[PDB]
């Protein structure tokens, strides 16, 4: 069964925000890193940001003005908040454990689609 | 009991992986109970680095090892020279350190075609600094605040107190020293125990590695 589940997500107006969440079966999924990753149509996989076991976060330097990542440890849940969304931000959004370990050492959620338009 | 050594080593699962690790979180895969044909690996692609240490390079199709570890990551071109024994720099000191008595090969190639994007790929990170240098084959995946000066941090990021990871930026128009390179480090274990990785029974001498 599924161990990493994204929710939130749906339609957003240009200029709006959306908050995504990702629930983990277990807190070991935050060892050593949990990441938010998206894939836009036409485009390559884009890492958005990570939260590390310590609770600290690192955001893609080209997106840091638009993104916040936070965690609720009791619920084993990671949050992504993005503001001032544009058509470019239409994508499948994924939650990935140990993204920095490469495609042979990571663990992927199922994804949630976020669509931006009028 | 002595192992079976009949299958070909699954180097493709390492060399052909879709996305490599970030160098600070370098990925290790154990290779065992298989036949390593380096003539086939060497001809599998065009490598820009293929250098061996602590071992005769031409004898690789005839040598046996108790295990092989394949370590893989991405760095920029100018840093590939730091993946060798006795080097220093951000990568050798803080990200991936080989021992002085290293036994293995370092294999690298330019991955501008896969790992760089118009507008820049930030997906790959490195560690900027540590209180002390890494020991050989040590991995540091922590994210403590680094006190860069005389201001105590008390665990807070800010003035003279720095988060220790940093994105590379990979665009296809980068100069080659700033373009991404995929690296595979093959570490040859030599414990006093039965071999589990061997070259092919009927082997050519691995001579093509001399003529780069
Ligand atoms: C990787 O992919 C290419 C094409 O599929 C293949 O020829 C090559 O042998 C593979 N590399 C390894 C080490 O198996």
Numbering used by the authors:
A (entry chain A): 1 to 118
B (entry chain B): 328 to 539
Question: What do the paper's sentences say?
Answer:
The entry of SARS-CoV-2 into a human cell is initiated by the recognition of the human membrane protein angiotensin-converting enzyme 2 (ACE2) by the spike (S) glycoprotein on the viral surface. S protein exists as a homotrimer with each protomer consisting of an N-terminal S1 subunit and a C-terminal S2 subunit, cleaved by host proteases (such as furin) during viral formation. The crystal structure of n3113 in complex with the receptor-binding domain (RBD) of SARS-CoV-2, combined with the cryo-EM structures of n3113 and spike ecto-domain, reveals that n3113 binds to the side surface of up-state RBD with no competition with ACE2.
Of 940 Å2 buried surface area (BSA), CDR3 accounts for 375 Å2. In addition, R346 is involved in a π-cation interaction with W99 of n3113. In the RBD-n3113 structure, the side chain of R346 flips to almost the opposite direction when compared with the ACE2 bound structures. The CDR2 of n3113 also forms an extensive hydrogen bond network with RBD, including four pairs of hydrogen bonds that involve Y52, S54, and R56 of n3113 and Y351, T470 and G482 of RBD. Surprisingly, apart from the three CDRs, the framework regions (FRs) 2 and 3 around n3113-CDR2 go parallel with the receptor-binding ridge and contribute 39% of the BSA with RBD. Along with Y58, the N60-S62 in n3113 FR3 forms hydrophobic and hydrophilic interactions with Y449, L452, F490, Q493, and S494 of RBD, further strengthening the binding.
